[PDB]
Amino acid sequence: GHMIHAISAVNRHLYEDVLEQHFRLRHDIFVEERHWETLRRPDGREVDSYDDEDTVYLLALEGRRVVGGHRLYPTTKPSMMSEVFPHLAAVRGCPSDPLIWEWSRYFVVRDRRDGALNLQLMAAVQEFCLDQGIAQVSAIMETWWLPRFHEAGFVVTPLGLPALVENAWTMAATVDIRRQTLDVLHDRIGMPSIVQQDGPRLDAVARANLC
Ligand SMILES: CSC[C@H]1O[C@@H](n2cnc3c(N)ncnc32)[C@H](O)[C@@H]1O
């Protein structure tokens, strides 16, 4: 029934309503709930330097209500890791590759927490990337994400030493996109497909190469 929608420059004309709704939800969740104060904005829209023409949003929709989601950004452009947290990837280096996209802003609205949505969101990043031929995603994450990744069968490669970011233990890592990982998650969520791609086809790897 309800699906995760892939929204990009090529199809956002079908989702302008939904995108604005998600920017406000990101403000409710990341700013007002999680107290990530560096992201507070007076328009009540949580929008940073990595929300631009090249961002891809994977948003969980129930009708037109956004109930969860995350975003992907090409590492061929300056990224959150390269610009804000390069010290977290000092051992292995910050990713920079059309085949590696930076994954951030994972959220689930309160009404949908501790339910089916979470594992669908995990499946969605794997499904979208495999479809696009993206090999890895990169992430800056709090260390409590590690068992969550492992629980979803995500293959994780740390890029550097964990460090305190504000008052929270944080690390940089890549996640390997795997058909095998996805197949198990499809079985677990009980759906052959979780990602809906309406409007024109997106060629993410090509776009990243242009950057
Ligand atoms: C990504 S781990 C969470 C931490 O990263 C910070 N963060 C997330 N996005 C950005 C950004 N675009 N610029 C600076 N800090 C960020 C948040 O304020 C939080 O402290």
CA angle 201, 79, 142 (to 5 degrees): 105
Rounded Cα distance between 185 and 89, Å, is: 29
Tell me which amino acid residue 133 is.
G
Per the structure block, which two tokens stand in for 191?
């759906």
Q: What are phi and psi of 67, to 5 degrees?
A: -110, -5
Rounded distance from Cα 105 to ligand 1 centre (Å): 9
Which structural technique was applied? X-ray
CB 10 within 8 A of CB 200: yes
Rounded Cα distance between 138 and 104, Å, is: 9
| Neighbour-count burial for 107-118, b at 16+ CB within 10 Å, e otherwise | bbbeebeeeebb
Rounded distance from Cα 198 to ligand 1 centre (Å): 30
CB atoms within 10 A of CB 138: 28
Domain count along the chain:
1
Rounded Cα distance between 202 and 207, Å, is: 9
Resolution of this structure in Å: 2.0
Q: Which domain holds residue 34?
A: 1-211
Strand partners, 58: 6, 70
* Pocket flag, ligand 1, residue 80 (CB < 6 Å): yes
Q: What are phi and psi of 190, to 5 degrees?
A: 70, 35
Rounded Cα distance between 147 and 150, Å, is: 5
CB 75 within 8 A of CB 138: yes
* Pocket flag, ligand 1, residue 38 (CB < 6 Å): yes
